[PDB]
Symmetry: C2
Subunit: 93 residues, 2 copies
């Protein structure tokens, strides 16, 4: 159980605890997930100046408004917010 | 710095350390990333019986053989392997 593998495990726990809402186990409504991503990463979206980056993730919700997201999507969007900030470190002088 | 936000941070560190290969910082070759995912999640692909699941992730590499992947893709495929195992817990009797 390395930290690398454990890091992902954390995404499973949180994803589940929230999957108990309207869904059942692996099911999760977009309405609930929409707040989830920002609920755990409320700081990131606060340290990111990229307005276009958040816009893409915001509108993306309307694209999959199907009423249900996907775990694979939960892990991709949560990170998309982080990388949308680290860029601050690497930049031209 | 909550554990939830820290979990994702781990993906950034590993992704970077490997981005120093042929790439530079945010760039990473598929050839190197291909081994990366399995290098850190060598156990998962060992505890997963889903042959079709791994097949999709395996062929996916040939699809983006462009020679360079994407961070967003690094986080989505690494997890795809985990979820391809947890299912063992939830199942019909």
């Amino acid at each position: 159980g390395s930290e690398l593998e454990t890091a992902m495990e954390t995404l499973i726990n949180v994803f589940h605890a929230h999957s108990g809402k309207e869904g059942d186990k692996y099911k999760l409504s977009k309405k609930e997930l929409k707040e989830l991503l920002q609920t755990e990463l409320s700081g990131f979206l606060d340290a990111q100046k990229d307005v276009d980056a958040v816009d893409k993730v915001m509108k993306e919700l309307d694209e999959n408004g199907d009423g249900e997201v996907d775990f694979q999507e939960y892990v991709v969007l949560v990170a998309a917010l982080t990388v949308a900030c680290n860029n601050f470190f690497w930049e031209n002088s």
